[PDB]
């Protein structure tokens, strides 16, 4: 009865060829024909088809494709191959080989709940939604294999293997020789990529007081390496049972996703306009955390932390650091954690936390509750030698620390503040802050913001621009002041660490203006900031 199946198969190929050629949106717009031609010349051997367009063209083959996908879908792939040959011939010399094309599907329906796939839906096309929770490494699967007999060396070529997580059984005895005599040649088989994923149902759809359920997914060729854990997806695929009890899995036919370092001349002109302004440094310091009152010198210090100094390597190989580090002390209140969260949002790379020290090469780490590493701060490296291990972890970053209160580690911080009788001024602040929170309750009921402060999306891009492009130095006249200041303070706790910290702060201030050189102006502002911050620790405690 094989000729009847051959007649059915060739009829299906004829109808799918007619669908790919004749479907149109009016005029000369044959969308699938044009898409197939563009994909083939782009060297992407794939096509994507909408089943509602197919249902409007012919209802019967669409219904058959849904109910018998393992029988009907290879005919559609074969029809796509034939139409691609017709479209592209005569191909140029060297490109005579005809490639093999993968067909994918889309479908406009409500997805089925992952808990409510009926047992009648085995071996049928279904649509499911969820979250990707895990993703394995890509592996190879054999499509066609060559067999040879162990004793008499007779061969069976081009034995084809069915798709999915299915095995296949070898011939038990020789066709032309003991039990199970055939072997598989490693050199004369064809292979394609595949990948396994795991899908979790959406937490919105879990019934109250229960854990979510899971399903395993199988993907092939162009559908591999398309997703990462955490992604939200909708999937069209065949519901299958893995080879009287079996576990189920889904063979994927279509995925739908439910979700810097480059600039325009407009962006460069915007950055340069802000750099050309005289009040740019004060404007950036004002733009840091506008919801939190006051703290002007602290906001200036955080701007210096974000921009940093230059980084140097002399001919003998000893490097000089560019990072800057800041510490905050005093009462546990006054929105310290909100300042740290703002720096975490604004910084090009960064982390907030209460190891963690490693994870920010070129970035910023905010540490709360610091009263809970000396090598990490100075050497930008930590080391270990315990039983059976010795390694070193190296990473470059700047650190902002908040404490609630060792005298040893105070040497490692460039700037220190003590936050500390507010009640009369705090009455006006209470009026403003409670008016803000009642306005937030009422709410519950692109360089500039509306209030003149800089936007976060512009500020983050501008910091990322400046760090990769400015790189300043000091003028000799700027260098001449620091020598006299150092000698006077030391011969009226003065150290070379403090001198290099002042030099780094002066370079950081000159970076924001996009200067070639730092001058006496930047040195004097750096000295003012250093005195105002550090002498609080000399006066207190």
């Amino acid at each position: 009865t094989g000729r009847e199946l051959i007649a059915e198969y060739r009829q299906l190929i004829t109808q799918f060829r007619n669908f790919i050629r004749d479907f149109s949106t009016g005029g000369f717009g044959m969308i699938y024909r044009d898409q197939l031609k563009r994909n083939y010349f782009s060297h992407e051997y794939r096509l994507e088809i909408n089943l509602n367009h197919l249902k409007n063209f012919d209802e019967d083959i669409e219904m058959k494709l849904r109910k018998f996908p393992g029988k009907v879908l290879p005919a559609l792939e074969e029809a796509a191959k034939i139409v691609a040959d017709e479209i592209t011939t005569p191909r140029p010399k060297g490109e005579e080989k005809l490639h093999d094309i993968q067909v994918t599907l889309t479908l406009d329906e409500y997805p089925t709940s992952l808990r409510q796939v009926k047992s009648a839906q085995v071996s049928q096309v279904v649509k499911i939604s969820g979250i990707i929770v895990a993703a394995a490494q890509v592996r190879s699967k054999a499509t066609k294999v060559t067999l040879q007999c162990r004793q008499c060396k007779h061969t069976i070529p081009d034995v084809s293997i069915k798709p999915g997580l299915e095995g296949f059984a070898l011939p038990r005895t020789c066709a032309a020789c003991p039990i199970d005599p055939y072997i598989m040649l490693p050199d004369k088989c064809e292979c394609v990529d595949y990948q396994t994923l795991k899908l979790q149902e959406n937490p919105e759809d879990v019934p109250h007081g229960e854990m979510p359920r899971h399903l395993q997914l199988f993907t092939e060729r162009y559908l591999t390496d398309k997703v990462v854990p955490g992604n939200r997806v909708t999937i069209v695929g065949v519901y299958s049972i893995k080879k009287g009890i079996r576990t189920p899995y889904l063979r994927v036919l279509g995925i739908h996703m439910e979700t810097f370092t480059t600039f325009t001349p407009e962006e460069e002109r915007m950055f340069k306009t802000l750099a050309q302004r005289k009040d740019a440094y004060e404007l950036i310091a004002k733009s840091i955390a506008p919801s939190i009152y006051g703290s002007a010198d602290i906001k200036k210090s955080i701007a210096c932390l974000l921009f940093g100094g230059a980084r140097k390597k002399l001919p003998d190989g000893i490097t000089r650091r560019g990072d800057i580090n800041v510490l905050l002390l005093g009462d546990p209140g006054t929105a310290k954690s909100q300042l740290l969260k703002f720096v975490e949002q604004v910084s090009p790379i960064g982390v907030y936390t209460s190891g963690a020290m490693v994870l920010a090469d070129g970035g910023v780490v905010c540490i709360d509750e610091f009263d809970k590493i000396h090598e990490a701060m100075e050497q930008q490296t930590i080391s270990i030698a315990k039983a059976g291990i010795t390694t070193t972890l190296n990473s470059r970053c700047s650190v902002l620390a908040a404490a609630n209160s060792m005298p040893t580690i105070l040497s490692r911080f460039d700037m220190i503040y003590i936050v500390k009788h507010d009640v009369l001024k705090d009455a006006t602040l209470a009026k403003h802050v409670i008016e803000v929170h009642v306005n937030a309750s009422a709410a519950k009921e692109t360089m500039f913001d509306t209030d003149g402060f800089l936007t976060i999306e512009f500020l983050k891009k501008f910091v990322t621009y400046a760090r990769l492009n400015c790189g300043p130095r000091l003028t000799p006249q700027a260098s001449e002041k620091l020598v006299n200041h150092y000698v006077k303070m030391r011969n009226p706790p003065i150290t070379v660490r403090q001198l290099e910290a002042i030099v780094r702060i002066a370079e950081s201030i000159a970076k924001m203006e996009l200067q070639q050189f730092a001058t006496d102006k930047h040195v004097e502002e750096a000295l003012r900031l250093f005195r105002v911050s550090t002498i609080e620790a000399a006066a207190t405690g």
């Binding site: 050629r21 004749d22 149109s24 005029g27 000369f28 044959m30 024909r33 031609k37 479209i87 592209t88 011939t89 005569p90 191909r91 140029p92 010399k93």
Partner: protein
């Protein structure tokens, strides 16, 4: 030179229409007389004038003889068999696109006509691509023959001219570098 100017030149061709209005005198265009019009009696006018009347419901357009399905199949057969480009009617693709755009009510067997025109365009495009790729491997000559190319096909393929101009400089540099 671009596709809009190609369509502009293609508008000067003549085509036959059947008016429903009537008029007594001729119309003395600078491009020559076209009238008079009698209702139900066909006559020949320019393509731009035909489309202008068809938009105002003043006539019915009669398609060219080469838009018959048998004639299109003959053209496709010759284009498939010949190694070079086969010969076509003047402004073939432009007149096809203009009439499908503005007068598809009057074309007969519209989908079959449209599909055959798309087939002819596809394989002529492949022939031109292969010829240009095989030319750009050359170093021995700066000449090729491209008989029966259409104006819009020539307009779409101007990268080859720039590539040949760039190749000639390096060839001249090698000739001047040859010692004596």
């Amino acid at each position: 030179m671009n596709a809009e100017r190609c369509e502009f030149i293609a508008g000067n061709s003549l085509i036959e229409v059947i008016p429903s209005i009537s008029d007594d005198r001729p119309i003395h265009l600078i491009s020559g007389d076209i009238g008079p019009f009698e209702a139900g009696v066909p006559c020949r006018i320019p393509v731009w004038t035909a489309i202008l009347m068809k938009r105002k419901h003043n006539c019915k357009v009669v398609a060219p003889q080469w838009m018959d399905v048998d004639e299109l199949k003959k053209i496709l057969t010759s284009e498939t068999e010949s190694q070079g480009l086969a010969k076509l009617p003047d402004h073939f693709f432009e007149i096809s696109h203009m009439l499908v755009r503005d007068a598809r009510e009057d074309i007969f067997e519209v989908e079959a006509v449209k599909s055959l025109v798309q087939d002819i365009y596809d394989r002529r495009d492949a022939k031109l691509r292969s010829s240009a790729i095989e030319f750009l491997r050359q170093n021995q000559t700066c000449h090729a023959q491209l008989d029966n190319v259409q104006l819009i096909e020539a307009s779409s393929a101007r990268a080859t001219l720039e590539a040949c101009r760039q190749m000639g400089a390096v060839v001249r540099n090698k000739h001047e570098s040859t010692p004596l």
